[PDB]
Amino acid sequence: ATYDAKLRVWRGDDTGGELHDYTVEVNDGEVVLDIIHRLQATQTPDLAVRWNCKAGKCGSCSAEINGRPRLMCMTRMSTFGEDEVVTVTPLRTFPVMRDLVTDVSFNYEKARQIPSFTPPKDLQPGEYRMQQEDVNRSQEFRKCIECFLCQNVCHVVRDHEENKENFAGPRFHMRIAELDMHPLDTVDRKEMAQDEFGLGYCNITKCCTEVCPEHIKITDNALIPMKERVADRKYDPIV
């Protein structure tokens, strides 16, 4: 069933743009990126996409497929009826560069603010001993293809621009969590997770866990534990 789809792609730059209507043959069993590549090859050669690989192990092909932040290389195009319109727009949290490519730089300058892994300053490289149950908690957060869909959907930064300076986002609080749960790390980071990176701005309305392609339990496994660990230090009257 190779029907003709009805698309609506946001075309424009930082000066303004529109949703334009296109018509593309959709063969059976192919993702949105295939339709976008067909569109580039036959109709609009200069359409910005920013893909790298086609398996979902990257984070390059993030967009908003029908109002939902998704990877373009994983959205099956069978989710949608043959008679309904598919509306592809860039991520609506970050500044737009061109048609479907946004400027993901906020979450690269947020990366070099979180203290990094520090081991004990006597241990040698061949002498690290960790048990599997100790590394299990952090190995889940290390599955993070940096899609930044979590950073896109968070209403703290998505709906309020003045909170970009105060909130680091779900991705960079999961980073703090997995550095805190590392069995060999040394720095605390519990005070700064609340005072510097504004962990308190997250209400627990998950909304992030709902968009992670890797199915990381961001809120239940990283954000609520860190909130409890900060309550231990600041809000526990047992002293």
Binding site: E18, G67, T93, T102, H155, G200
Partner: protein, 264 residues
């Protein structure tokens, strides 16, 4: 404008581009919470039909009965405070603490932040609020005391368990008979919901760095995490069981028969 209409973001003049029925979950949450709160606040203040003096049933909405205005036999821990002035519920000891425990719950917080406060109604729908401070200012910084209402909930669950255990008495000795089944199921599900708490998961073993150094707390943390993966289910399940238990007991206290297996 404010958040997705800012001058530097993509120019879509739409609150959301979602085409699904994204407003259904907040509506259902609102209706469920409203129905439960209305029922609970009417029943707790009715002041009657809470005690079967024969088979010794007591409603969870009247769990510790510490007044001398209670039905003779109802007080299991003693009668301490006189009679109350008609606007203090007969279970003023436990109902404030249960309400606080469910209010400062990491799941219920998500539910009503989405539904009532209109912090994101759905996942990617434009928020109607202009300024946002999260749980950082005064009234919402107090949600971090959930771990003490968790201890209160443990104690209240122990009281409920004692009541359900002594509810096994027919007039002629031991007894059974479907009031016991409902009370016991309600207590067991209350225990499950209490042990599914994120504060329980943190206090038992979630705060440790080395699990290999703690074999018992690792086991407890594993089991509590398996339970906690479904904390959302047990909240609603326990609301429903509370309603059903109170309803059945009220019907039996006022009038219907109790379906017993041991004589009266």
């Amino acid at each position: 404008a404010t958040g997705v209409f800012s001058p530097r973001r993509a120019q879509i003049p739409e609150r959301t581009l979602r085409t699904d029925r994204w407003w259904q979950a907040p509506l259902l949450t609102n209706l469920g919470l409203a129905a439960f709160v209305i029922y609970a606040t009417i029943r707790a203040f009715w002041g009657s039909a809470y005690w079967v003096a024969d088979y010794h049933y007591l409603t969870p909405f009247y769990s510790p009965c510490v007044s001398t205005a209670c039905a003779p036999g109802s007080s299991h821990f003693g009668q301490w405070v006189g009679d109350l002035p008609w606007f203090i519920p007969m279970a003023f000891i436990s109902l404030p603490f249960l309400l606080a425990f469910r209010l400062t719950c990491y799941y219920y917080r998500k539910a009503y932040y989405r539904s009532v406060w209109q912090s994101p109604t759905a996942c990617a729908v434009a928020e109607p609020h202009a300024k946002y401070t999260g749980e950082t200012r005064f009234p919402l910084i107090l949600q971090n005391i959930h771990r003490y209402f968790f201890y209160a909930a443990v104690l209240i669950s122990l009281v409920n368990t004692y009541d359900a255990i002594t509810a096994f008495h027919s007039p002629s000795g031991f007894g059974f008979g479907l009031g016991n089944v409902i009370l016991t199921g309600n207590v067991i599900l209350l225990w499950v919901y209490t042990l599914s708490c994120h504060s329980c998961r943190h206090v038992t073993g979630g705060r440790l760095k080395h699990f290999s150094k703690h074999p018992v707390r690792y086991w407890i943390w594993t089991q509590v995490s398996k339970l906690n993966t479904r904390h959302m289910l047990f909240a609603w399940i326990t609301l429903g069981t509370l309603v059903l238990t109170d309803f059945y007991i009220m019907l039996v206290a006022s009038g219907t028969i109790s379906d017993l297996r041991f004589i009266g």
